[PDB]
Amino acid sequence: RSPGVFFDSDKGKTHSSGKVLYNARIIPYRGSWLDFEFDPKDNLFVRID
Amino acid sequence: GQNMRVAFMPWNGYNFEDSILVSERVVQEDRFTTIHIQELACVSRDTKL
Amino acid sequence: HARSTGSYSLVTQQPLGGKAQFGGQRFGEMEVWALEAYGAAYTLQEMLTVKSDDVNGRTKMYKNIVDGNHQMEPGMPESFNVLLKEIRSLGINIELEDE
Amino acid sequence: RVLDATQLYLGEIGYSPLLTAEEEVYFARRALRGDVASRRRMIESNLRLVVKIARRYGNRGLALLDLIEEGNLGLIRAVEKFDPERGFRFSTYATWWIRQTIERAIMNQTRTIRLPIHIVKELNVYLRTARELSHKLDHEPSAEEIAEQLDKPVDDVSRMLRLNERITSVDTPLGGDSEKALLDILADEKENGPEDTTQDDDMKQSIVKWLFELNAKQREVLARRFGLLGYEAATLEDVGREIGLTRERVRQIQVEGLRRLREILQTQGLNIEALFL
Amino acid sequence: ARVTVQDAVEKIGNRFDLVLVAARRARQMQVGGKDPLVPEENDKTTVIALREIEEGLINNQILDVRERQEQQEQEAAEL
Amino acid sequence: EEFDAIKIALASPDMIRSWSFGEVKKPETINYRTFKPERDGLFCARIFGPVKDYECLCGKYKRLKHRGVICEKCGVEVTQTKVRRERMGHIELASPTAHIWFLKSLPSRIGLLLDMPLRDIERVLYFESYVVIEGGMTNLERQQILTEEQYLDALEEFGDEFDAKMGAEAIQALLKSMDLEQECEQLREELNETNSETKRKKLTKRIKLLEAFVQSGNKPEWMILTVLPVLPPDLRPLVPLDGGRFATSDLNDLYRRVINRNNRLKRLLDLAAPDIIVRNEKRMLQEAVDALLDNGRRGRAITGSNKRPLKSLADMIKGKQGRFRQNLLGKRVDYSGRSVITVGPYLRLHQCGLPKKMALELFKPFIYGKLELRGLATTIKAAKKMVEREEAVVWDILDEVIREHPVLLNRAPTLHRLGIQAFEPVLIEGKAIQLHPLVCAAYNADFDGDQMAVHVPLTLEAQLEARALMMSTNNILSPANGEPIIVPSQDVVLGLYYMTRDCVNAKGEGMVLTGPKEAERLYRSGLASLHARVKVRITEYEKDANGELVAKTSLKDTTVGRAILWMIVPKGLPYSIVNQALGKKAISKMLNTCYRILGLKPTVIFADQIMYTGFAYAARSGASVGIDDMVIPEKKHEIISEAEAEVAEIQEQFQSGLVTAGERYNKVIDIWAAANDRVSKAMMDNLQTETVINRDGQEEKQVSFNSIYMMADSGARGSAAQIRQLAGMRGLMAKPDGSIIETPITANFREGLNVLQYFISTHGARKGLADTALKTANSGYLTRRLVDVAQDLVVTEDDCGTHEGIMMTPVIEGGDVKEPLRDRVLGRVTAEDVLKPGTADILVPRNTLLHEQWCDLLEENSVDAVKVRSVVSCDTDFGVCAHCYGRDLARGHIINKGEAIGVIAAQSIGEPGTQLTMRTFHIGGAASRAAAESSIQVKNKGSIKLSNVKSVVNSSGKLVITSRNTELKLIDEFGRTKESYKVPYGAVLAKGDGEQVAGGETVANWDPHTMPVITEVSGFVRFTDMIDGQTITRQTDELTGLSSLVVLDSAERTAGGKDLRPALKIVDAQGNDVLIPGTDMPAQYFLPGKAIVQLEDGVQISSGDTLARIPQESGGTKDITGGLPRVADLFEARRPKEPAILAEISGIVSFGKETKGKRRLVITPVDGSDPYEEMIPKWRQLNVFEGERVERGDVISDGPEAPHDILRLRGVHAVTRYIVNEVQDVYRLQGVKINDKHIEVIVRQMLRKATIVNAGSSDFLEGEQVEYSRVKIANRELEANGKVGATYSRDLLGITKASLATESFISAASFQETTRVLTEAAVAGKRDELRGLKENVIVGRLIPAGTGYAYHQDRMRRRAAG
Amino acid sequence: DIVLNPLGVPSRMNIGQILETHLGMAAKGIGDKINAMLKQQQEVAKLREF
DNA sequence: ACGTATGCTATAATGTGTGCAGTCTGACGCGG
């Protein structure tokens, strides 16, 4: 997987909600990971590594 | 590999499930005679004794 | 490849694997259930003990075959005697309760 | 909260005295005279110093938590034997102890085959001599090239390099493919298969029948010498202890038993047949 | 006898108790050196034991009677 | 050495000391140069024993002269090395340490017993917070956690009177103080008060643990280890390599971590070091102990040299790579060899080629044996060399022993029992094994590079077993289906086909022969073709009423070839069987016929002769495969070009905005699907009858002698499906996801694909072959799952003495009867006196087997429905009776007692699924889904008979159906069901209920690519909870502006309108609701997600109009990939997300209370005074409409049925009928043939445990769930003694759970969950007395089944006799 | 030289082998004609035209 | 004497982190 940025979405993390939760992820060549992800209530979160 | 006169037809079930019926003439020409250059080795070690 | 009797494993005390090391063919559990289905009980017990671990059985059976008496002489595979001590080493009382 | 054994301890040292020059002297002066609380403090205080040292003594034998524990033991022996009356600081004196105790404890619990200090100590000088040579030779030094610089034996260098040769675990997967470990390959030395077990049983039962086919005074003397029927394997001269009491007649009768037995192996069908064996 | 073992199963019934009866008889000829009832015609114990069962000479009741008939001869004789 | 049981109990610190023969106090393995143990080290000989057989270390006492002498200097005994793996050790832990298996292996166990959570305990262990052990001053109560701050508060204030400590020390004292006697009574008292579900569950489980703990004799302190056992050094080896290197197990390394830290703690306790350091040391010690027992569990597994984790103890008992599955149930075996197999077309069925140099090594001890007999070898090393030199006379001895000696031939994988068959070895010079063509089917052995393992049966019993059970001749029919698996294919079938098949005149037409010998005479003379119609006088032999054969002589008009084949045909079968052109399917009946008539001998001979003549005539013909043989359609470019413009039309309509994407997606599939069948049939029509140029006078029409066609028509290789790719069209391929590519492959293999046509072919090719590798694991894993639960089932009793059974009805589905009653009730013992129509005389008795000839009289009498004695209806405790099972389909008559069915059943079920992922997965790549079912046409005249139907007449004048599961029967003159269909919801019927129809009439009609929502009342449409943006969307066009509304579901829906249900409410002209006739339900049809609506708000409607159209997108070739997970879910008993509701007890329905649409039901039965309430969703629609006469288990809701819901209400024979139908439905879709009795086996095992409801004479009480056999044995003594009956209610269990439920813990740990099984079994102190096969195969004893059944029962009378 | 099974073809759908066979035969047919002219020791012009 | 072990060095130095972060369906067990 090529370093840079990449936008994905688990087409149904919680098939309970069945909501397509969109997420972004910054992939470096060296360094820590930087992810942004929504949730059932569309609250933006950040999960380093 | 090698090309040769082939004929597609059954033969007393000696070509049952893709089984191959090869002439002795192929074996006579030693055309399907692969060479295996094996390499052995003999080690003189230093044991406790 | 072919094997009658040869090397034996280090702990499992069953034969090794492959023509590389001169090892018998593996008889897995799927291969085992096949004999259970047939009903052939000795053919299986024969392939669990004398042909594999049973240290008493393998040598005893060899001597019996050359005598001509193809006689079943089981004892109990080593690989199980290992499993007993292995569970005891894990702090669990596993003893063989008798008749 | 915190459930890592590492961070928990590293927390508890982070809330422990950080002593000044005259403070160290105040506690240490009472610590030698046995104040109890004093010996506990100087130790509690300088656990933080042990961790900074074990930060460069990791990745060599044991883990970081194992280096700290053995590094703490160095600080304790430093506290057992410090001189407060001397104007020189403690942090200086304690570092010499914490560096030693770690190195020493790594030398023992690093290698599976317990290598004593003496064979190890030497090995290091052979390895650290290899450094100097390697940089200027630009070639990893041979057993000879190391022997030429120290002016020491060839076999010594070589035998010390043999003890450096490390281990592969029996449970290790094989060729980046955990199909089978070394146990599923490596053969059992002790027990040979039925073929070898029955060889001796059949060969030694054949001898029981050959000893009963010979003479009573021939199978008496021959058997008890080799320790076949008797209890101890005696010699030509020692067979005299029983009833023979002879040196010449024991040697003639031993060989007479063997000559009649060599014809018993030529007629049954062995002799030259069982000579290759 | 060599190909078929159905004619042998006809006589006893249980495929499993057939192997046990045939084995026990095969062992008597293999060890005791007992005589085969059917012409052996260069066949191993396996086949011969089946032949005797197939034609109807060997049975669970037959072999148990014959056992204690040799063993009761020994009883009266000893004491 | 011979025992009865195996026990598991908790290792007491005192107990561990009993096994240990010393204390390892040092990590020192060996000295560096002197390769010998160190002083009280990990390889110490003073603890674990001596190195060699009878040799001390220093060398003072040697061999047996000093039998059991203990040395002075080194202090080492002189016994065998035997003891180096038997003798254990121990380590005296400075501070007590917790067991990870009684802490992390859930349930917590240590926490479950204390009534204490995990966090609480762990924070005590890692020294974060103290815990109260016992507070004298009632200020602090027990098991109350105090932070480092809160401990200090109580110390100066209260103190002393409160005892609280920290670490593993504390929790041990907590376990040592707690009273199992008192806290058991306390929990029983709290249970009498107000018990719920969760409260009673928790209490009862703790209660049983507490009683179990006291009766097991275990003490909760042993959860904490004061003593740690050491494994014998030989079981954790330090052995040297050939290369001067050494190698050690990871245990030794993990042990050195434990001992070092433990000894360092001893040192720090000597120094009285500060507690902060002691804490770290104790945390470390626990980390090392937990890492030794189970490394990867509590935290990061301690990695070693090659950055990989150290293999711990638990790991060698854990799962596949553990001792159980890898080094105990599966074994490499002596007298075993494997090699490339090749064909053996000369062999008979009971024969197989075995290389000389293979059989040489294999029969090594048999050569040495026969050699000493002849007197050629005096000893064995003499015999060894005789063999080595390979001298001439040794070959002749080897040849002697092998005669009349069977060998086992195995092929991987071993699916079913036939995966091994025995033969009589034939020595052949060459390294290749030669296998019999007909049994190639059983192994699935293709001569393309296959290898087969050989095994020599040593014991005479194994020689008898191999000849009796495992011989190829004794194994003909499959156990799965009573059908011959031994059957020609390939050349053999084609040869017979060439022979029998006829042609016009030819040489010597219409001639006249004395016999089938004169036919061989004339053909081989060159004055007749095998395809010449000539009258021949053949004398057929037909069996009479007795055993005697009747002879009949007659003139038969066949062909020269057919006549010659009669020579092979035994005399006992009729000639009409070889009078047809013979194919694979026809030939399979010849052998079955031959078997059911004559017997075994005749078939083996027949089988061989068929094979020989098949091959011979197959090579005599000279069939070939040229490029002129693959003839494609003459007007293929005419079909596609205009079928493309067809799809191009809808593509332009979609972008306009009328036909939706989902409707187009289904509509385009139907165009291509028609075109695909159009090319298939036009290519087969121009190929099959391509020989339109004959002679005689001018012309005649005839079957084509196209090479490819003959090879497909005969049923030899390929089919109409394959020829489509060759000359026709390749077809539509499938993506690796599951979706089908919109653009299929147009080209075939002759014409050649262009560059993309091949790129497109790839997509389908790779995904088809991806599911050959990866999906096989799911089907192979199912085989494993099925087997374990069905291990114990063996035929025990002869007659269970029960008169119960399961009413089996003819499986009529898909117009023509899918599975007849005759085949469904074949070889099954009828459990009801079933006579003929006229009830006045018994035709068939009770205890009787239904042979094919008895089933023939069922046809004459036309049986309606039959109560067959089933497996589940068996009363035999621990097994089943031969009557309940019936015939062994493999054999062909009543099953033997002692034969192990369960394993035979599991194999039969898993074998097809697992194989159906390699046969049509490597050669197949073009999906052929033809779901064009749009209208039912009835074929025979009959009266229309609907059942479970509730229809309503529409504006048009047509009976529209408003019920989901509507069935349509076809009743004949006398009054019996001939044809049966599934009419779906919103289907339009031609004629209603009871009306006559003619043959070839469309009785029903509907749209397949749509699921309509149809009304029951007339009036106007109202919009309720259909807010734009929240629940639905809107899209308009132009000039006028026709808008469609599309209902969003929870996926495409916001959080605003989540609790809003969208529905199209019916109203009248005034604006009020319209009641549904004869119910208090205002008319309201709830629309589901993605429901497309064309009528907007304020539109007039009649009854029968379509309100909305739900899309029906289902274009995924189910095959076996997406159909086995459905089988799994059934077996595993997994409730769905839409289970259907059913009535409990029969009574008078009375609708009750409601909760924001959530419907309740206050049912008040006629006899039953106490009401019963159950809740129902809002969006789900019911079937009944309130106030009704409901019976036990009427269908209330529509959807998938929950297996637990079926047995709970409608009993055993209902859940058994469900699983059997449901499973078979999936396998019948694939053409997999399985007898229902095999599924019924697993079903029975799934009904093993049962929850008790009512107190009994035994201390059963409520909440206990015991096995069904054990509780019924208690009921046996109860009906004799009186006392209190133990009423029950049988529960259904999933496969994975049913395996772990058996009392045998050995069977459970051998399966999976091995970490948990053992811990639960240790705490319970359970002793396994061994009944199952897995249990006795492990210990390597006689299997308590099959051959060993006669032996094991003879040991059971040793126990009975005193 | 080798006799293959024609049934290892329809099921397999690898008709390239049959085309390999046909062309190989044609190719050999041409070699057999050239072999004959070189054995007959004909001419440079005759070989050139063919 | 030989091998193994035990000991001290006195500038000051006093809170760690290193390393893979597209498995997946299914099933409970502790808090919240």
Ligand SMILES: Nc1ccn([C@@H]2O[C@H](COP(=O)(O)OP(=O)(O)OP(=O)(O)O)[C@@H](O)[C@H]2O)c(=O)n1
């Ligand atoms: N990954 C694989 C490949 C092959 N096999 C075994 O090898 C057999 C033959 O595989 P293959 O020759 O590729 O398939 P066939 O169905 O024989 O098709 P073909 O006609 O192309 O030979 C399979 O049935 C199976 O027993 C397997 O178990 N796993």
Ligand SMILES: [Mg+2]
């Ligand atoms: Mg193959």
Ligand SMILES: [Mg+2]
């Ligand atoms: Mg193949």
Ligand SMILES: [Zn+2]
């Ligand atoms: Zn000694």
